[PDB]
Amino acid sequence: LPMVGPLALFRFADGKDIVLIFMGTVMSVAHGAVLPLMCIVFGDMTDSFIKDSMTLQEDMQSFAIYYSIMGFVVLVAAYMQVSFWALAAGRQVRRIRKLFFHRIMQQDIGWFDVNETGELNTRLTDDVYKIQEGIGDKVGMLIQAFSTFITSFIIGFVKGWKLTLVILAVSPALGISAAIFGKVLTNFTAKEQTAYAKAGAVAEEVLSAIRTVFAFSGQDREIKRYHKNLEDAKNMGIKKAISANIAMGFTFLMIYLSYALAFWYGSILIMSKEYTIGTVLTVFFVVLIGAFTMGQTSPNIQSFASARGAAHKVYSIIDNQPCIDSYSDAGFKPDSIKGNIEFRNIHFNYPSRPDVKILNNMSLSVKSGQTIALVGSSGCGKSTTIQLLQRFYDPQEGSVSIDTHDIRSLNVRYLREMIGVVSQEPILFATTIAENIKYGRPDVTQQEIEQAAKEANAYDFIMNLPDKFETLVGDRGTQMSGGQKQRIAIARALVRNPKILLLDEATSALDAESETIVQAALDKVRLGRTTIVVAHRLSTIRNADVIAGFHKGDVIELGTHSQLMEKQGVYYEDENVPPVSFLKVMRLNLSEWPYMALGTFCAIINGMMQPLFAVIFSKIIAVFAEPNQEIVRQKSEFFSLMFAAIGGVTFVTMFLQGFCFGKSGELLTLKLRLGAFKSMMRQDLGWFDNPKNSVGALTTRLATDAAQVQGATGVRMATLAQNIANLGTSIIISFVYGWELTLLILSVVPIMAVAGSVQMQLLAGHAAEDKKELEKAGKIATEAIENIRTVASLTREPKFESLYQENLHVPYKNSQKKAHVYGFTFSFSQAMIYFAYAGCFRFGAWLIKEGRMDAEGVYLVISAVLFGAMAVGPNYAKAKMSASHLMMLMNRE
């Protein structure tokens, strides 16, 4: 919901970043500007063709060279735009990750507790990815589209005083054709969505009972339901389909209608001799492409807004200054500390839950070398003092001093290294045993490691390690038991040579052997260390010079072993699915052969009628070549009529298709649901042996797969029909009067597609590899966020930062090269259209100058093949899954 200004999305752009963004913006506007010039040169080519229809070599060459320069400019501009924007996004994302980490670590523990580890982890992964994508991918395309719309409007204004006005008039026509659309659509869709609830609920109740009500008696009962309720639903169902279709149908009419009128009005100018046919062609195309550009943008603006919201979150968590300056040199650095720690009259409340005044007037005093423990009831706030000394919480009041020095008046880092604390269950970080033991201090000799191993008796589990301390811990740090992990953590603490030691519940959850061994090691390290311990081990309490009473989060008593003893102590699916094909799906509807037949026939009509737009478009383009003028307006009126006719025949064919495919799909839905339910309900009592077939699971299966297969059986066939009809009609029309242009275009186009749309995000294999690596990049981040407690205990935030930037280094390179290759493929895909245009048009000029085709023919073939290729445009996977599910669920038994 919340959002931050557009400039704030690039608050971390250095000089290099701003120059990169500036070049990206300039190139984006260059692409946006070149597209409408592409349109204008297309119009001029049209004009030259019509003129020659009744002389071309020079102008043909000029237009071809213009086409070529436009193509080269497009290639270079696209490559540089995408590359620069991606590099800027990568640099920004690297800076964002670094600063987000260095601010997270700068936050105290309370900040972490407010934001659960899951939320922070999903931020650091998903929201950072979203920032990267939004900025880099979409900012440039958004700017390009805005520039394209501006260029289209300026061209429409300069070339057309009123030509944009008829288009402005169709604009409300779709606006109100979004109202004729709107009323019917909204009301009848509400009706239909209400309607399905009948079958939904009838199925739900009985598939929740499942024979519990003696429901075999209700086998006939539900059957009657499907005799009525299903029959009702399909009725509503078919209505919805027709409803939906008419909407689209209506849309078609208006847009086609709009086209017609615009064309008509244009003719009125040309015969009136205030416009040129090429001028109306170019202005119409530029306004059309300008309109399409906004539709393309819509997802781009959605992505921009999403990235901006994620950016608000990230920047907010970046600019939140902590309640602790863990880095600066604020405070004293005595360099010689006695080791006595005293807390007097301390208060504190949790940042998240202020009602917890557990920290109540601590009045504890510990002298140098004065080993003192802590006792109390479980969960009585004992760990509060441990967090306090750890500089986890800021006492708003109360004096906490280490030898007459306010802890708050001392540098955090200056004090952390001289205090050592193990973790609750120290999670050996994602590294080897050697690094884990090393993490006590950045540098230390192996002799200290040997001494720590002897002190912790770690040897006991060191004989069998492949390379002793160099041995790798394991996978996920879930290979060694609790005792050995505790011992290695203790050794890691020891190597730090801390002056004051603290342990939190470090003596528990261990086997007898392990617990005694760790207790022995702990006692052996007790010497020369004033340790305030937190655990529930009786010996630790017993072996202590002085003992304290920590009950209810406050000191109740202090002093000798005997006095505290008196103080009421504790004692006191292709592979899975068999061979199955859509032929099964059709044959299941053998009773519906005529209806599938009529649907097929209507689909093939739709298929034929898509190309005829091309024939009529070529004819309207090339009609103006005629010397006469009365025939010109007569034929323009004729083509207006024929555009209306294609609109109407589109209306009727969409109606028949909606009707027939609704009937067929819905009757298939009824038959599938009937066969299914009969199969499940006629089976024996034990079919519930598989928990996967739960009431919820069966309900979702029946609800979804039914509609999905409805879509499958019909839409798959209709789409295949439309594509085959389009391609066949295009190839056939090209072959009527062309043996070579057919081949030339059928070559350049598909080889543009194979190297075009598909490559952008699929080819070269390593794109998926770097995507996977970015996916696993957070492997260290998730560990760090969860272990931040122990990271603070041992001050490893710089160390984990170094490791994280290291692990990011390679990711940086893969992201860079993936961006470069993606930019290359995108630029090539963009340029291939220009290259094909130039090649085909020059070839046609060749073939007419030799006298094979005709300007009518060249324009018709080129436009028809182009629109057919662009007119070709997921459910087959879900279609097959639903089909196989129902078949294996009904055919058996």
Convert 387-453 into a string of H (helix), E (strand) and C (coil). HHHCCCCCCCEEEEEECCCEHHHECHHHHHCCEEECCCCCCCCCCEHHHHHHCCCCCCCHHHHHHHH
The CA-to-CA distance between both ends of the chain, in Å, stands at 53
Domain 419-498 top-level CATH class: alpha beta
The domain ranges of the chain are 166-274+585-738, 339-418+500-505+528-572, 419-498
CB atoms within 10 A of CB 598: 17
The CA distance from 579 to 227, in Å, is 32
- Antiparallel, parallel or unpaired: β 500-504 and 419-421: parallel
CA distance 468 to 445: 16
Query: How far is C-alpha 395 from the chain's CA centre?
Result: 43
Q: Which fold has domain 339-418+500-505+528-572?
A: Rossmann fold (3.40.50)
Tokens, residue 237: 């169902």
Beta-strand pair 363-366/372-375: unpaired
Cβ-Cβ contacts under 8 Å for 581 (sequence gap 6 or more): none
Q: 359 near 346, Cβ under 8 Å?
A: yes
Nearest to 744 by CA among 656, 844, 824, 617: 844
Rg (CA), the chain: 38
Q: What distance in Å separates the CA atoms of residue 846 and residue 839, rounded to the nearest whole number?
A: 10
Coil, strand or helix at 752: helix
Do 166-274+585-738 and 339-418+500-505+528-572 fold alike per CATH?
no
CA distances from 564 to 558, 567, 662 (A): 7, 5, 84
Query: Are 414 and 328 spatial neighbours (Cβ–Cβ below 8 Å)?
Result: no
Q: Kind of pairing, strands 546-550 and 359-360? A: unpaired
Separation CA 407–CA 795 (nearest Å): 17
Please state, in angstroms and as integers, the Cα–Cα distance from residue 123 to each residue in 310, 680, 808, following that order.
8, 45, 17
| Angle formed by the axes of helices 180-209 and 695-737, nearest 10° | 140
**Burial of 390: CB neighbours in 10 Å, binned 0-12, 13-18, 19+:** buried
Counting every residue written for the chain, the total comes to 893
Q: Is-contact 88 135, C-beta < 8 A?
A: yes
Give the C-alpha separation, 756 to 213, whole Å.
60
Among the CATH numbers 2.40.110.10, 3.20.20.70, 1.20.1560.10, 1.10.10.10, which is that of 166-274+585-738?
Answer: 1.20.1560.10
- Cβ–Cβ under 8 Å, residues 469 and 516: no
Helix (H, G, I), strand (E, B) or coil at 787: helix
Six token digits for residue 688:
């519930």
Give the torsion sign (CA, 655, 660, 665, 670). Answer: positive
| Experimental approach taken | cryo-EM
